[PDB]
Design a protein around this ligand. Structure first.
Ligand SMILES: *C(=O)[C@@H](NC(=O)c1c(OC)cccc1OC)[C@@H]1N[C@@H](C(=O)O)C(C)(C)S1
Length: 265
């Protein structure tokens, strides 16, 4: 039984684990704490890029955005390298997804615009996809820091899986924009030790990770079987029991993903 295995992992890693895989043609939903709230951490950047693509014509990807020293406030591997030239919206989407660049995500939120530095418009985008659960209230670094249990900047494995399903598998985006989002997540560099590690090499995996304080580690993916059957996999975790400086444990997500892969193979 899956739930027993997930509970064993919780004890092993002194963690709380949430998992959701939506029902398909022949499988019921897989769900473990799937309606409990977990911090978004950086996972919000995937639907953020979808919001920015949806909102604008494609030539918008070519708009140059400039920024300065005081815009660099969070882990930002790419944005730090280009501060002297600026970055296009396309480059910022690339960096936000593939390197989880925090400054890029902040600039993309500002591009969306409106109250709360774009957080309200981001939430509005989720509402338009039928997600009445998730909320973004702050930008980086603040959004990764809410105390355990706090509802600010949270989603649920259930809600975010259904969002990602509509973005990648459904018709939320036109095919040209859908393909851009799909490709960036396909080329993600931060996810090798999470959902990807739990699925065999002949399964295709696209994903977006998140990491925070209190041992927070998430990964949201779309996976395809070797025969092209897709499944959406949302895994979220925290380790409140070690306090603010509890280490995130990637291996917990790899093992949860291995357990899901075993059921889906
Ligand atoms: C978003 O989840 C980002 N996370 C952070 O910047 C972060 C930590 O990451 C080391 C640790 C504690 C707090 C925060 O947020 C202030 C970026 N995305 C993650 C990820 O994709 O797993 C990175 C690549 C580790 S940074």
């Amino acid at each position: 039984d899956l739930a027993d295995r997930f509970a064993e992992l919780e004890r092993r890693y002194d963690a709380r684990l949430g998992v959701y895989v939506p029902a398909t043609g022949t499988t019921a939903a897989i769900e473990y704490r799937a309606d409990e709230r977990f911090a978004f951490c950086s996972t919000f950047k995937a639907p953020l890029v979808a919001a920015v693509l949806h909102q604008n014509p494609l030539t918008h990807l070519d708009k140059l955005i400039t920024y300065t020293s005081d815009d660099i406030r969070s882990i930002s591997p790419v944005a730090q390298q280009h501060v002297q030239t600026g970055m296009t919206i396309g480059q910022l989407c690339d960096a936000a997804i593939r390197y989880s660049d925090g400054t890029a995500a902040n600039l993309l939120l500002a591009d969306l615009g409106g109250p709360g530095g774009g957080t309200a418009a981001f939430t509005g985008y989720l509402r338009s996809l039928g997600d009445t659960v998730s909320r973004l209230d702050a930008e980086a670094p603040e959004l990764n820091r809410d105390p355990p249990g706090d509802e600010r900047d949270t989603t649920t494995p259930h809600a975010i899986a259904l969002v990602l399903q509509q973005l990648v598998l459904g018709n939320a985006l036109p095919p040209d924009k859908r393909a851009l989002l799909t490709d960036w997540m396909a080329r993600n560099t931060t996810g090798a030790k999470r959902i990807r590690a739990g699925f065999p090499a002949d399964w295709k995996v696209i994903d977006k990770t998140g990491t925070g304080d209190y041992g927070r580690a998430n990964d949201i993916a779309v996976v395809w079987s070797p025969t092209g059957v897709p499944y959406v996999v949302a895994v979220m975790s925290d380790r409140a029991g070690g306090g603010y400086d509890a280490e995130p444990r990637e291996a917990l997500l790899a093992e949860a993903a291995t357990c899901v892969a075993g059921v889906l193979a």
